[PDB]
Amino acid sequence: MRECISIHVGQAGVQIGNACWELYCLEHGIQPDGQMPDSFNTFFSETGAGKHVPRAVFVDLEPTVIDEVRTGTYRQLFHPEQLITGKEDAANNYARGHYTIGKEIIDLVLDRIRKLADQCTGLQGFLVFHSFGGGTGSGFTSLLMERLSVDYGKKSKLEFSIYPAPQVSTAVVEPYNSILTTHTTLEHSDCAFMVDNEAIYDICRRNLDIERPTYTNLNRLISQIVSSITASLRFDGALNVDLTDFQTNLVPYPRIHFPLATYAPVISAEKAYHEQLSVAEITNACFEPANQMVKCDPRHGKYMACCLLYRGDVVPKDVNAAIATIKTKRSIQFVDWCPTGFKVGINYQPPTVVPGGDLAKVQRAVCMLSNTTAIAEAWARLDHKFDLMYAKRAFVHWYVGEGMEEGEFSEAREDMAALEKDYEEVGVDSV
Amino acid sequence: MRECISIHVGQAGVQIGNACWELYCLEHGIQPDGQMPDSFNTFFSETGAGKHVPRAVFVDLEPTVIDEVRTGTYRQLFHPEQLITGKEDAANNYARGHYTIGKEIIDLVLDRIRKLADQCTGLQGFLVFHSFGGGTGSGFTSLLMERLSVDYGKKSKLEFSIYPAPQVSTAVVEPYNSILTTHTTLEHSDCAFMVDNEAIYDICRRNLDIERPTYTNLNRLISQIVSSITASLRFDGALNVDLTDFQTNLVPYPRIHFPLATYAPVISAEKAYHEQLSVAEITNACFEPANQMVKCDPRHGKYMACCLLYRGDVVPKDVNAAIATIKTKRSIQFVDWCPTGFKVGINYQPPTVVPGGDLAKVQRAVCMLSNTTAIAEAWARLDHKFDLMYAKRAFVHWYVGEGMEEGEFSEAREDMAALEKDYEEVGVDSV
Amino acid sequence: EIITLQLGQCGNQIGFEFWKQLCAEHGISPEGIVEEFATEGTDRKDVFFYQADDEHYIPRAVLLDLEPRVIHSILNSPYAKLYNPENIYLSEHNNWASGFSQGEKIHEDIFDIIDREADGSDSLEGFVLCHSIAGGTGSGLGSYLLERLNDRYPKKLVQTYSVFPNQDEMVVVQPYNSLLTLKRLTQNADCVVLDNTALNRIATDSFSQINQLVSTIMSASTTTLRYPGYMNNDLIGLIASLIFLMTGYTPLTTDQSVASVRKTTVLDVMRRLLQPKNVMVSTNHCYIAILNIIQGEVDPTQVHKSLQRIRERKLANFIPWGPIQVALSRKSPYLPSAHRVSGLMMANHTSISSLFERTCRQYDKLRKREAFLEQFRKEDMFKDNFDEMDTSREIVQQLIDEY
Amino acid sequence: EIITLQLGQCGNQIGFEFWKQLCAEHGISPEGIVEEFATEGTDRKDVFFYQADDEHYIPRAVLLDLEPRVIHSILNSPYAKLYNPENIYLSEHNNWASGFSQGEKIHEDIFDIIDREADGSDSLEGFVLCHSIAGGTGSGLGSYLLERLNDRYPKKLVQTYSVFPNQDEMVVVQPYNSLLTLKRLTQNADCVVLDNTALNRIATDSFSQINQLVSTIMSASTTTLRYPGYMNNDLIGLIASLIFLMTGYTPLTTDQSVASVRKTTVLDVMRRLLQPKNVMVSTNHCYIAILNIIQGEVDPTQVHKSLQRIRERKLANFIPWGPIQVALSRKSPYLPSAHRVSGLMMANHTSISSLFERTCRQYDKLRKREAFLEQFRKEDMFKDNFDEMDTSREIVQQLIDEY
């Protein structure tokens, strides 16, 4: 009834979707061929027999990642027509993914999404998985979000985006794509749960004892975050939280909608054996500045909204005591215009351990979505890099000779400056 | 409920902690893997299953001793994250352990101690095991104690320190480190139970018939002392004594807080068979000048406070009779401003014999913490050696070229002179 | 007779455990069958249940919810078959404005169900509402139902068990929903405040246990109505004797805390009901009214003596401008009488004003900066302006001034 | 009726074994159940116990302590379930100033418990306090409670069993705590000195046995109140007949020392109660008052003859400026009467003054050199100055002069 459609764009989105759907199949007992040896309805559809087709599309402008999906262990899980692929990728170019290469694919993606929506009864919204500093993860994501806003102008559109890291980076033109995507989607998005590869690397090293993690472990952690977010739709709990609940409780103003994701019980097997992870402990770990999965120090800013999504053996009184302890803390400061900055969700299903993963089996877990003004510093860094590269006008010819104008660069930079001003304004205390 | 955290710094501290935790595991029936085939709560924490994790940290700036711990028989007892280690030791240099090498580790140690404190409910205090004449045992110990005073400015901080011996010595720069540590920690400590390697060597030779003892036997005796001290927290007895009781009853003035530890029934198996060790006998042995574990003759000074901690088959009337006999003695003299200089604690648990040790199984035992003015002579010797080496300015370049100034040397020497003056003043009779 | 309207996840659960307690008390089998030992029962069942030709009993309950998951889980419980599938309603597909908009949208079927249930009772007395005021579902849907019900049925009582948001623990948009729900409660509600903070405080010193306690409170409140006696044989009798409320129950003891079988008089109980600690909710503020319902053996001489002593000891304070009540009931003959005598207290006290002063302070702490108004503008009700909000705030201020 | 306030490890134990003795005497099962043979008992139980609806009896006791270990061990004893968990209080987390500071800090809950216990008794007569004057816990906490109690309840008696520190055996800071506790005792206490030195001396010629003897003394003191007779049917009757005290008990015999069944008259017992050896505590000093309570068969003719002979033999000395008492009771019908007739003595004698002269001498032996004052300056009470100490010392000096 509360069906939701997940859209995975680009290599980052497709691989995170691989991890997410592996986790969903494990959680709901669905075999990797769609058969089982309700709860599995907001994300899967039943076709006559036991076949459960996931309610998602995998769209990329490059055949490689989608073909890996098509021939992997989950080759028979996804509908072959919902694994949409192009011929030539966007080559880390926003213009290619938005204007030149993305226009030859957007119609097919919209047709498939329309088929999925028609197959649904009540559509809660969309989950868009993508990366900020990619070609199709930026241009095609922005194009798709604007087309969805044109079509489904009322359904919520939550996006899980890999924010560029402060120091580590795999591409040279990431600031351009990030600024342009922020412009276009900020026009047409509800809330964007943000994450950094560098922060997850640090989390893995410090907590999971892994010194050489790959993208696979990062995707597993992100999939755990997404599972914690969607558990209320997929399972039954004391306090249910829907997508509209996220949108309402985490977005104070239409432009300030970039919360940061966190996951407390990130722990290895032996350490989990030696610990007694409780509600208070996991909450304190969530509010620890070193456990943030976006490399921004929360002490540099003020929280405006927090969404604590507990799951498993969790008692509401313990949650209330832990939240009261957090509020009594002095290092954790909130904005003065949000006397109540905690949306609490509790689910009865403990997190499922993926066979072959690094996370240990725990009795309870919490995912914390925090909207804070500490993201303003990350925005400032991103626009500073954009300003340097645009002042030298580097790489601009690649974007211009592909259906874009330098005026769009200037407009996007001005919009980002306005966003920084808005963050500064909401940061200050009322007088 | 009355949880206490023990901190072991340096090689001496880590090895004494090895002995202490072996003794604790034997006393509480805990297997060396943390499982048992309450009393075990002030020093251990339960994690779901029978796993009992000791409430301690093992911090050193050298990987060798901590790695021996990590691969020994107790490899699976300690939490892997609470065995903190560095890369390069302090090399018998106070400046290295306090300013240069200790600053790269103090944050991690404080984070782990904060985790342990949060895991506790009521924190009685800290037990710091270290050596006076070591690099990390002096500089890092002083740094850690000052940071703890900044953070936990009210919890008691009792330290078990290996005071440098009058004659035997393993390092050349021991007076420098000892004077600087005394300065810094004397600013920020409650009481320091003192012990000497030379005195324990003499005790072993005279009582235990061992002609070639190692550091292992010394550590076993020191662990017996610590067990007698903490028995009241760990077990039930007629007269319970807490850490605050030690601090109150043994420290008359804020600077004069250096009691000496003693243990009466240090005896081999055959001699224990031939003796009838009773309360009076063990008390008289405690007050014998040859059984002191700090090589200072008590007859050269005046007792200001004694803490007799009996354990095992002990009757309060016998204790009172023995203490009255001690008071009637003329060789044992007290200061005139302490008409009542005896804090008495009685525990129902007899000392546990370590399999492979030299101490025989006895029915009762007593540990005597005595604050006396006989330690003033040891301080005088230490500052005389410091004065010689500093007058020649030997080894001073090692300390100065590592974040310290000669002004700190002069200030520490002046503080030690003030401490000697304070001991002299409290020694004299009131008129 | 009576009807129960439970909304939101909070209300849905509240109802689940309330009916669990009821069926336990009246000896009603999980499937609606009646146990053999209870065949000749004297307890009145019409009040909360109506029997069926199949001899099974059906609650006079309606399930409402914006989301399916909670009720779907309910129907997987051993108690699933008991409820009436016809009455249960689920939206085919967290904001107050959205909730009220849906309420406007789904008027017809809800009132169809309500009318069907109403016409099956000869002497319906009032309504019972269970919901939370913070979440989007409960707040808005209860607002809409209260409005259209007070409009539809101007001769029936409306009683609510409203759950208030925790405050010591920091719904991010709770101030708006709470303020609007309070507006509607003052403007339409006939008459039981509830807060998670103090409730969990007393629980300490899962939602399953919290709401078990809440259902205990509700059942003990309705006991005498369920079990006819001499006095207080109607809900209106209850309301007249008091008229916002707060509650407290003495024997709130775990199943493991029966070891201390303390000789429990009536005096000690009625005394315990007075302390602020037992008041389950969190200027020389004083009382307005106090009612104590006592279960078990009771001697009116003991009651008189307790009243005399408490009056002399002046442990309570009353209004200077106006001139309590102790009613007695009988325990169900089935549940063990682990308590020799037990006591429940419902009172009206001026201190409750503080609650609103907090929420007002919360709301004023947001309206000055226009926080999280984007979603509200989406709905028709707040599409043009927010005069609704201003009127609600001024109404709450007027109520505080009146207190 | 009566209440017991026991503080510190000493008081906690004292209470444990006192209640052990009481339950042994009255035939109260460890769990609070009553034995079958004692169903028809005639002994009065309200004085120290109040029964419960579950038929179990609960002591009118409150447990106080700065540390958990002792009471935690108590609750692991076979007698654990007997006590009231509500009344027991433990600090969540050795100095008098710290103790009094905490007492100021935790006023509310302690007096809540005390009021709850008090309101359950119709004819409360006084208070009983058990504590040690040396340790930090007992001294300071008893000081604070005595002050605030004499302030709160100006019409109730306050009786204490104060344990004094050993002196022949060298708390290092005992002089300060003892002196301050004595100040408070003179300034607020209505009316039983105790010392470890002479107590263990008589024991000879573990704390378990010492406090068993102490509990024996307490129970024998309260016997007649527990067992109503003709005369001395109230604690106030006791106090008036005497008014600092010291005590002695004749049949202080081990369980192994019953072999010598010595023909024990009343004369020999009452004689034995006079000797300094039996006085359990350690200028032609003389008596002020003497009371002898006798258990077992007793002929008043024998009592008169013993009194006559002792008076003629002038074994005692009395004040020249003022003009004893021998009361009789009945043994509990349950404990074996291994003694044909037994005797307990409580007296007021001037020699007790020496105690304070020692402690004063101790205190003066420290105040001249400012020993161990660092911790005291930490607390607020002694933060500015120590005028408290000077006033206490002068008060004790005044008391010694009065003696």
Swiss-Prot record, chains A, B:
The gene is TUBA1B. This is Tubulin alpha-1B chain. Pfam families: Tubulin (PF00091), Tubulin_C (PF03953). It catalyses: GTP + H2O = GDP + phosphate + H(+). It is found in: Cytoplasm, Cytoskeleton. The modification Omega-N-methylarginine is found at residue 330. Induction: Autoregulated by feedback control of mRNA degradation. In excess of soluble tubulin, TTC5/STRAP cofactor triggers cotranslation degradation of tubulin mRNA. PANTHER family: TUBULIN (PTHR11588). GO terms for cellular component: cilium; cytoplasm; cytoplasmic microtubule; microtubule; microtubule cytoskeleton.
Curated annotation (Swiss-Prot), chains C, D:
The modification Phosphoserine is found at residue 123. GO terms for biological process: cytoplasmic microtubule organization; meiotic spindle organization; microtubule cytoskeleton organization; microtubule nucleation; mitotic cell cycle; mitotic sister chromatid segregation; mitotic spindle organization. It comes from the Eukaryota. Changing residue 355 to P: In CDCBM4; the chaperonin-dependent folding and hence the yield of monomeric gamma-tubulin is compromised. One of its GO terms (molecular function) is GTP binding. GO terms for cellular component: apical part of cell; cell leading edge; centriole; centrosome; ciliary basal body; condensed nuclear chromosome; cytoplasm; cytoplasmic microtubule. It is found in: Cytoplasm, Cytoskeleton, Microtubule organizing center, Centrosome; Cytoplasm, Cytoskeleton, Spindle. Keywords: Cytoplasm, Cytoskeleton, Disease variant, GTP-binding, Lissencephaly, Microtubule, Nucleotide-binding, Phosphoprotein. GTP binds at residues 134-140. Phosphorylation at Ser-123 by BRSK1 regulates centrosome duplication, possibly by mediating relocation of gamma-tubulin and its associated proteins from the cytoplasm to the centrosome. InterPro entries: Gamma_tubulin, Tub_FtsZ_C, Tubulin, Tubulin/FtsZ-like_C, Tubulin/FtsZ_2-layer-sand-dom, Tubulin/FtsZ_GTPase_sf, Tubulin_C, Tubulin_CS. It is linked to Cortical dysplasia, complex, with other brain malformations 4: A disorder of aberrant neuronal migration and disturbed axonal guidance. Clinical features include early-onset seizures, microcephaly, spastic tetraplegia, and various malformations of cortical development, such as agyria, posterior or frontal pachygyria, thick cortex, and subcortical band heterotopia and thin corpus callosum in some patients. Tubulin is the major constituent of microtubules, protein filaments consisting of alpha- and beta-tubulin heterodimers. Gamma-tubulin is a key component of the gamma-tubulin ring complex (gTuRC) which mediates microtubule nucleation. The gTuRC regulates the minus-end nucleation of alpha-beta tubulin heterodimers that grow into microtubule protafilaments, a critical step in centrosome duplication and spindle formation. Component of the gamma-tubulin ring complex (gTuRC) consisting of TUBGCP2, TUBGCP3, TUBGCP4, TUBGCP5 and TUBGCP6 and gamma-tubulin TUBG1 or TUBG2. TUBGCP2, TUBGCP3, TUBGCP4, TUBGCP5 and TUBGCP6 assemble in a 5:5:2:1:1 stoichiometry; each is associated with a gamma-tubulin, thereby arranging 14 gamma-tubulins in a helical manner. Gamma-tubulin at the first position is blocked by TUBGCP3 at the last position, allowing 13 protafilaments to grow into a microtubule. Belongs to the tubulin family. This is Tubulin gamma-1 chain. It comes from Homo sapiens. The gene is TUBG1.
